[PDB]
Amino acid sequence: APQQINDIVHRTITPLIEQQKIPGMAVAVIYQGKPYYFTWGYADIAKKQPVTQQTLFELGSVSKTFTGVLGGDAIARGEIKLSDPTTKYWPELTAKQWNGITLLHLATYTAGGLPLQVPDEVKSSSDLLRFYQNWQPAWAPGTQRLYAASSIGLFGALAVKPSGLSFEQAMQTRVFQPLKLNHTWINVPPAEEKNYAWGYREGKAVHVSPGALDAEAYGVKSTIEDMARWVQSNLKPLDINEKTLQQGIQLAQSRYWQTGDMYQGLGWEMLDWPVNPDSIIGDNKIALAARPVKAITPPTPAVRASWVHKTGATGGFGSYVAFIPEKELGIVMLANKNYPNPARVDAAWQILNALQ
Ligand SMILES: *C(=O)[C@](NC(=O)[C@@H](C(=O)O)c1ccc(O)cc1)(OC)[C@@H]1N=C(C(=O)O)C(=C)CO1
């Protein structure tokens, strides 16, 4: 990589790894549209397997960006509309509180307080139906945002109904394949198990456990090369050949709601660029932050001068993606230890600010 890119990347990441005691990490910086990779440490400490450009990491919540784009692609295909009520795609959802709750609300965490997580006790599709039927909104739809995997997760499951494909089949055929993300998976196959890093939590090797709507909210595993291709795709949607996918990417970056300096997209979250690092560095220390939202009516189409980003974690991994369309600049950081979000954003900001 150009020495400048090399130098900022290393002087920022080495101290981060040391301060947070991260076992393994991979970073990609997209500069003027070209990817540069860096790797440190171990994918598997016991087996002394190093992190490489082929190592798979759990993306955790960064998976929501794929769900948002897959949903955008379904809208572009005319299979669903964000303005449709949730009950159009799940008729059995006859509980009256669902009247007025649209796919837009589900996708942007504005349905009225759906929970951060689907209860672990929900193990069957029947359990799932009961869970949503019995849920009691704390607020009217479209008035407050409460980050929720049960919200965007349900959106993903419903968005693929019209197609008749399973969520995984739809993700693979409509998003992974067209973008050539050949090393990105919802279920890691046996052929790839040797590249699947272990996550580390309190010194124990761990992999994310199965759960209701896991594919839709936190189930993707990917390599640093594929994630760099994912950022390139979202940086320049106009270069994507598949029509509906190009539109779906653009739709995921439209601004649907505003809370303070942040705007909510489908999966992606955005701030205006240039951004004050404090506005973003704007943490996982709060298990629930309910925030009033202002609807952007109609939504603002994807803005190039934005800091577009998404953080994610699983018990043993921590990831972060951020890019600036206007500068053809972006970064992906994947680690096999869940460490503080503020540290991720600060590191990413130091690197991208330096390169712009
Ligand atoms: C997304 O990262 C987030 N959490 C997860 O994806 C998983 C985790 O927090 O360990 C997870 C696994 C299994 C569940 O039933 C629930 C969650 O989505 C809920 C959320 N997001 C974060 C972020 O975006 O920074 C967090 C650090 C907290 O977890």
Question: For the domain that residue 354 is a member of, what is the CATH number?
Answer: 3.40.710.10
The CA angle 208-213-215, to the nearest 5 degrees, is 60
- CB of 315 closer than 6 angstroms to any ligand 1 atom: yes
Q: For the chain, how many structural domains are there in total?
A: 1
Closest Cα to atom 15, ligand 1: which residue?
117
- Using a 10 angstrom Cβ sphere, with 0-12 exposed, 13-18 middle and 19 or more buried, the burial of residue 272 is middle
- CB of 312 closer than 6 angstroms to any ligand 1 atom: yes
The answer to whether the beta carbons of residues 118 and 213 sit under 8 Å apart is yes
Q: For the residues of 10-62, what is the DSSP string, one character each? A: HHHHHHHHHHHT-SEEEEEEEETTEEEEEEEEEEETTTTEEP-TT-BEE-GGG
What amino acid occupies position 247? Q
**Residue in the structure block whose two tokens are 């082929």:** 54
Residues 6+ apart with CB under 8 A from 218: 58, 59, 60, 61, 63, 64, 149, 208, 312, 314
Q: Which of 238, 305, 273, 251 is nearest to 71 (CA)?
A: 251
Residue 61 bears catalytic tag: yes
Cis peptide before 274 (omega within 30 of 0): yes
d(CA 313, CA 259): 23
d(CA 125, CA 147): 23
Residues 6+ apart with CB under 8 A from 133: 93, 94, 95
The answer to whether the beta carbons of residues 10 and 16 sit under 8 Å apart is no
Between the alpha carbon of residue 137 and those of residues 92, 143, 149, 152, 240, the distances in Å are 18, 11, 15, 16, 39
At residue 199, φ and ψ (nearest 5 deg) are: -90, 155
Cα R_g (the chain), whole angstroms: 19
d(CA 98, CA 149): 18
Q: Which of 280, 288, 293, 287 is nearest to 321 (CA)?
A: 280
Structural tokens at position 327:
């500068």
Closest Cα to atom 1, ligand 1: which residue?
61
What amino acid occupies position 222? S
Closest ligand 1 atom to residue 211 Cα is 15
Range of the domain at 22: 1-356
Is 156 strand, coil or helix? helix
For the chain, the straight-line distance linking the first and the last C-alpha, in angstroms and rounded, comes to 16
Q: Which of 252, 323, 211, 254 is nearest to 70 (CA)?
A: 252
- CB of 87 closer than 6 angstroms to any ligand 1 atom: no
The answer to whether the beta carbons of residues 275 and 261 sit under 8 Å apart is yes
Chain centroid to CA 206: 20
At residue 211, φ and ψ (nearest 5 deg) are: -165, 165
d(CA 145, CA 127): 25
- Using a 10 angstrom Cβ sphere, with 0-12 exposed, 13-18 middle and 19 or more buried, the burial of residue 152 is buried
Q: Which of 217, 198, 257, 274 is nearest to 45 (CA)?
A: 198
Closest ligand 1 atom to residue 338 Cα is 27
Q: Which of 30, 41, 19, 62 is nearest to 218 (CA)?
A: 62
The answer to whether the beta carbons of residues 26 and 53 sit under 8 Å apart is yes
d(CA 147, CA 291): 9
The answer to whether the beta carbons of residues 110 and 145 sit under 8 Å apart is yes
Q: Which of 252, 296, 279, 258 is nearest to 342 (CA)?
A: 279
d(CA 220, CA 63): 5
- CB of 321 closer than 6 angstroms to any ligand 1 atom: no
At residue 53, φ and ψ (nearest 5 deg) are: -70, -10
Q: Which of 33, 39, 31 is nearest to 3 (CA)?
A: 31
Structural tokens at position 133:
């039927």
DSSP E strands: which ranges in 174-231? 199-201, 204-206, 221-222
Provide the CB-side half-sphere exposure for 22 (13 A, CA).
30
DSSP conformation class of 93: -
Closest Cα to atom 14, ligand 1: which residue?
117
Is 326 strand, coil or helix? helix
Which of left, alpha, beta for 267 (phi over 0: left; psi -120 to 50: alpha)? left
The answer to whether the beta carbons of residues 266 and 308 sit under 8 Å apart is no
DSSP E strands: which ranges in the chain? 24-31, 34-44, 49-50, 57-58, 144-145, 199-201, 204-206, 221-222, 255-259, 262-264, 269-272, 291-292, 294-300, 306-314, 317-324, 329-335
Chain centroid to CA 288: 18
Cα of 107 vs centre of ligand 1, distance in Å, is 16
Most ligand 1 atoms within 8 A of CB, residue of 269, 314, 333, 344 to mutate: 314
Between the alpha carbon of residue 128 and those of residues 92, 246, 353, the distances in Å are 11, 32, 44
